[PDB]
Design an enzyme around this catalytic site. Structure first.
Site, PDB file in Angstrom:
ATOM      1  N   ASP A 195       1.009  -1.177   0.114  1.00 56.94           N
ATOM      2  CA  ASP A 195       0.013   0.006  -0.008  1.00 56.94           C
ATOM      3  C   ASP A 195       0.876   1.361   0.145  1.00 56.94           C
ATOM      4  OD1 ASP A 195      -2.249   1.683  -0.009  1.00 56.94           O
ATOM      5  OD2 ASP A 195      -2.502   1.635   2.242  1.00 56.94           O
TER       6      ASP A 195
ATOM      7  N   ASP B 161      -1.518   5.496  -5.297  1.00 56.45           N
ATOM      8  CA  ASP B 161      -2.004   4.600  -4.273  1.00 56.45           C
ATOM      9  C   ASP B 161      -2.354   3.234  -4.624  1.00 56.45           C
ATOM     10  OD1 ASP B 161      -3.316   3.515  -2.119  1.00 56.45           O
ATOM     11  OD2 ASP B 161      -4.957   4.981  -1.936  1.00 56.45           O
TER      12      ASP B 161
HETATM   13  C1  LIG Z   1      -3.019   7.517   5.594  1.00 56.17           C
HETATM   14  C2  LIG Z   1      -3.965   6.437   5.914  1.00 56.17           C
HETATM   15  C3  LIG Z   1      -4.409   6.739   7.364  1.00 56.17           C
HETATM   16  C4  LIG Z   1      -5.144   6.375   4.763  1.00 56.17           C
HETATM   17  N1  LIG Z   1      -4.852   6.207   3.451  1.00 56.17           N
HETATM   18  C5  LIG Z   1      -5.681   5.815   2.572  1.00 56.17           C
HETATM   19  O1  LIG Z   1      -6.815   5.391   3.095  1.00 56.17           O
HETATM   20  C6  LIG Z   1      -5.311   5.729   1.020  1.00 56.17           C
HETATM   21  C7  LIG Z   1      -6.002   6.999   0.393  1.00 56.17           C
HETATM   22  N2  LIG Z   1      -5.778   4.490   0.429  1.00 56.17           N
HETATM   23  C8  LIG Z   1      -5.233   3.355   1.142  1.00 56.17           C
HETATM   24  C9  LIG Z   1      -6.326   2.415   1.570  1.00 56.17           C
HETATM   25  C10 LIG Z   1      -5.544   1.215   1.805  1.00 56.17           C
HETATM   26  C11 LIG Z   1      -6.616  -0.407   2.046  1.00 56.17           C
HETATM   27  C12 LIG Z   1      -7.714   0.025   2.610  1.00 56.17           C
HETATM   28  C13 LIG Z   1      -8.450  -1.184   2.621  1.00 56.17           C
HETATM   29  C14 LIG Z   1      -8.099  -2.490   2.378  1.00 56.17           C
HETATM   30  C15 LIG Z   1      -7.010  -2.761   1.968  1.00 56.17           C
HETATM   31  C16 LIG Z   1      -6.015  -1.501   1.678  1.00 56.17           C
HETATM   32  N3  LIG Z   1      -7.143   2.073   0.238  1.00 56.17           N
HETATM   33  C17 LIG Z   1      -8.322   2.413   0.070  1.00 56.17           C
HETATM   34  O2  LIG Z   1      -8.828   3.098   0.941  1.00 56.17           O
HETATM   35  C18 LIG Z   1      -9.151   1.714  -0.765  1.00 56.17           C
HETATM   36  C19 LIG Z   1      -9.138   0.432  -0.867  1.00 56.17           C
HETATM   37  C20 LIG Z   1      -9.987  -0.297  -2.169  1.00 56.17           C
HETATM   38  C21 LIG Z   1      -9.858  -1.705  -2.303  1.00 56.17           C
HETATM   39  O3  LIG Z   1     -10.654  -2.417  -2.438  1.00 56.17           O
HETATM   40  N4  LIG Z   1      -8.560  -2.193  -2.464  1.00 56.17           N
HETATM   41  C22 LIG Z   1      -7.922  -3.618  -2.518  1.00 56.17           C
HETATM   42  C23 LIG Z   1      -7.194  -3.975  -1.574  1.00 56.17           C
HETATM   43  C24 LIG Z   1      -7.375  -3.732  -3.884  1.00 56.17           C
HETATM   44  C25 LIG Z   1      -6.040  -2.743  -4.148  1.00 56.17           C
HETATM   45  C26 LIG Z   1      -5.544  -2.811  -5.557  1.00 56.17           C
HETATM   46  C27 LIG Z   1      -6.005  -3.745  -6.434  1.00 56.17           C
HETATM   47  F1  LIG Z   1      -5.454  -4.092  -7.726  1.00 56.17           F
HETATM   48  C28 LIG Z   1      -7.114  -4.419  -6.170  1.00 56.17           C
HETATM   49  C29 LIG Z   1      -7.867  -4.368  -4.968  1.00 56.17           C
HETATM   50  C30 LIG Z   1     -10.921   0.413  -2.657  1.00 56.17           C
HETATM   51  C31 LIG Z   1     -11.039   1.827  -2.782  1.00 56.17           C
HETATM   52  N5  LIG Z   1     -12.039   2.672  -3.215  1.00 56.17           N
HETATM   53  C32 LIG Z   1     -12.593   3.751  -2.574  1.00 56.17           C
HETATM   54  S1  LIG Z   1     -12.423   2.335  -4.853  1.00 56.17           S
HETATM   55  C33 LIG Z   1     -13.724   1.488  -4.890  1.00 56.17           C
HETATM   56  O4  LIG Z   1     -11.102   1.699  -5.516  1.00 56.17           O
HETATM   57  O5  LIG Z   1     -12.666   3.593  -5.324  1.00 56.17           O
HETATM   58  C34 LIG Z   1     -10.257   2.298  -1.595  1.00 56.17           C
END
Ligand SMILES: CC(C)CNC(=O)[C@H](C)NC[C@H](Cc1ccccc1)NC(=O)c1cc(C(=O)N[C@H](C)c2ccc(F)cc2)cc(N(C)S(C)(=O)=O)c1
Length: 375
Positions: free
Chosen positions: A37, A222
């Protein structure tokens, strides 16, 4: 075989539910699948049973575990978890040949974080200390790696879309992972991997919005996010243009909102009817930019027989642009922390067809690019 050959193909992903690397924690060894991540800065692992987890971290079995006696809570755009801070020995068996003592959050409870069938059990936050929880005093994993060892302050990601795979090269670059030239954009500020988008095109047609809109209130790279996420105004303009460019076929409104899937008979998907999409990024020289270009094969994502069902994976955001897997799956992406820059090149593994390919091209002339950034 290049010098970094043992780090090639060290990533996996199940049913497109996130790219993970093996990490070995504690003593004796406990190996777990860890989500890569670039959108966060905490290293955290499942540490108790969970319906979606095949394995978890057992601190009582690690002799080298040290309790920091402090709780930690991390909310993401999607999901959240709570846990307990400690330090332990960490190595990446298909990563650098080193072992470090790193901060580790043991995840004890979570909400909508772990994903059923994804085969990963933790998360590796590769971004900077500024966005670490509880605060910037909690040294992120990559910081510890660089401080404790002679591993160069750089890593690179090749995310290979559709079971999926790819490579995380740590301490350098592998040339088998890309074609053509690497083009670099500045890391605007070291918190998220913040970049500046200066122009957007659908099939070569300028979206014609102020570049301030594209970076309101930030633009980040990201790997933890699936979609290309765009600020509301930008998303609306983009979808209107994509519809216009794909007008030989009609799709329901819910398709464009990611609420409805459309399926085609196996192998018959009409890629040709959908436009390419280009993002221009600020370059390393004054008034110089370059552009990265993705295909429908990147932004239309396959979803779980003789039917290929797809989700439109460009979506709206209220927290700035998020260049997630939809972008990254087109490219080899170099996170050159040492030189405060991110490089893009055409991925050797990116999904394309006999008519179109993902592209990284330049240079272009773009004025007033320093104005595009939100303050
Ligand atoms: C600084 C920190 C406190 C917060 N940082 C964040 O939230 C940043 C902006 N995003 C990282 C954060 C990390 C994470 C969350 C939940 C499960 C797994 C990983 N990601 C999301 O918020 C987020 C995840 C996902 C997600 O499903 N991730 C999976 C694991 C994935 C990743 C890569 C692929 F190729 C396929 C599937 C989706 C979102 N979305 C809002 S979306 C639908 O893609 O627009 C948003």
């Amino acid at each position: 075989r290049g010098s970094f050959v043992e780090m090639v193909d060290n990533l996996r992903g199940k049913s497109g539910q996130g790219y993970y690397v093996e990490m070995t924690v504690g003593s004796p060894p406990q190996t777990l699948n860890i989500l890569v991540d670039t959108g966060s800065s905490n290293f955290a692992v499942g540490a108790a049973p969970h319906p979606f987890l095949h394995r978890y971290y057992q601190r009582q079995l690690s002799s080298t575990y040290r309790d920091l006696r402090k709780g930690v809570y991390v909310p993401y755009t999607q999901g959240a978890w709570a846990g307990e801070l400690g330090t332990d020995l960490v190595s990446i068996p298909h990563g650098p040949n080193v072992t470090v003592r790193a901060n580790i959050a043991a995840i004890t409870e979570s909400d909508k974080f772990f994903i059923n069938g994804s085969n990963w059990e933790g998360i590796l936050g590769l971004a900077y200390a500024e966005i670490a929880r509880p605060d910037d005093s909690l040294e992120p994993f990559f910081d510890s790696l660089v401080k404790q060892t002679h591993v160069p302050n750089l890593f690179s990601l090749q995310l290979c879309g559709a079971s999926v795979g790819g490579s995380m090269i740590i301490g350098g670059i592998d040339h088998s992972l890309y074609t053509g030239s690497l083009w670099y954009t500045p890391i605007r500020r070291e918190w998220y991997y913040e970049v500046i988008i200066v122009r957007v095109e659908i099939n070569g047609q300028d979206l014609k919005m102020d570049c301030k809109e594209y970076n309101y209130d930030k633009s980040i790279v990201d790997s933890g996010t699936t979609n290309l996420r765009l600020p509301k105004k930008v998303f609306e303009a983009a979808v209107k243009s994509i519809k216009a460019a794909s007008s030989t076929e009609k799709f329901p409104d819910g398709f464009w909102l990611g609420e409805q899937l459309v399926c085609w008979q196996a192998g018959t998907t009409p890629w040709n009817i959908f436009p390419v999409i280009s993002l221009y990024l600020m370059g390393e020289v004054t008034n110089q930019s370059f552009r990265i270009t993705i295909l429908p094969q990147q932004y239309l994502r396959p979803v779980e027989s003789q039917d290929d069902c797809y989700k439109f994976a460009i979506s709206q955001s209220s927290t700035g642009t998020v260049m997630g897997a939809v972008i990254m799956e087109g490219f080899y992406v170099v996170f050159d922390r040492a030189r405060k820059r991110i490089g893009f090149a055409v991925s050797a593994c990116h999904v394309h067809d006999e008519f179109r390919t993902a592209a990284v091209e330049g240079p272009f002339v773009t004025l007033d690019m320093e104005d595009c950034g939100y303050n």
